[PDB]
Design a protein around this ligand. Sequence first.
Ligand SMILES: CN1C(=N)NC(c2ccccc2)(c2ccccc2)C1=O
Length: 390
Amino acid sequence: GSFVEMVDNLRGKSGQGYYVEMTVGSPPQTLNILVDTGSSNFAVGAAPHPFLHRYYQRQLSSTYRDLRKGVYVPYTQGKWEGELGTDLVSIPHGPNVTVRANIAAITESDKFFINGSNWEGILGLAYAEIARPDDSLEPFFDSLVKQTHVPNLFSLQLCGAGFPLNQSEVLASVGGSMIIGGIDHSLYTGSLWYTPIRREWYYEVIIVRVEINGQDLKMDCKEYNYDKSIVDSGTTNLRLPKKVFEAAVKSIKAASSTEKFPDGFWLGEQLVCWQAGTTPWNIFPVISLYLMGEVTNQSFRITILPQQYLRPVEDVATSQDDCYKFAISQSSTGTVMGAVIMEGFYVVFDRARKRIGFAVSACHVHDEFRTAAVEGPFVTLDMEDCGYNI
Ligand SMILES: CN1C(=N)NC(c2ccccc2)(c2ccccc2)C1=O
């Protein structure tokens, strides 16, 4: 492990997000910032909000520069709005550099901040193409690489605890690592396998085959990537296109048929509980996603356990039962490999070589009988046809 200063610099959990400490302005203002590979703006709370105990105070920063431009960011379940500017930014448990970066000072929001998440802003790590208002607003990572000698690569080890963390525990617990400019070999086991970044906007990838307990879902592979497949630390669940979700849920139900679960469970709305320590992991299947390899006609697979796709939640009665929600849900916007999937792996965002690496995480939750896996190669034909075109 050659990046000790950055190891264990994340906190949080899949449901509320994983965050890294950052500083903004002169003198430095410390904020906790959501690590989001699914967006491209660096945006921070800059006005009082009921869910924020701190926020960016531009009037207190001598290095603040006003860009005299507003930004309006609506998304499916809410929105944020703010004022654009630039300031000096650092990552205390990061590279030892300070950069001048764009900052959207959030002045108004709806269902953006999450009560008790402990973060006050978001770090959009994807590409300029999806930055708001447009691609002229340089993302943080682009600024960092341009201004310093930091290599154009970052890697994420998101560590799910495998059980619920209360308010005190989640603040005191290590949630993982964000390695800026490198790969830390202590964070994974086995080999790193790489899939191409199809296009630089979201971190888009191509899924070529899906299995549930080794059984091929047998859908036309274009369905798996309709209308895109992305790697997103800012999404909790593994989200699948409607038809893929319907086929996967049918297969997962069939594999786990020895126990009947309510419709609300499969809809990802309701929790299910078992007496302490009796979760029947073995009845649930493993899920393998095959990804396009770097070599022509070659693929590899990543395999997750129910310890990844069943998200630990506290019981309504804070009982001694072990409870979970089903963290696979449908999408009308393509596949999303969210935090519950990323929790199984060390994920290398190799922007320099336009590729994403996956290896079994040193912190993935498993049992004595099964582990997550990253394996290959497999001979896979016409993988280009798996990609969707509008
Ligand atoms: C799926 N997803 C995401 N990865 N980041 C969010 C986002 C952020 C900025 C602009 C559009 C979407 C997000 C993250 C945290 C809270 C709210 C929204 C979002 O909705």
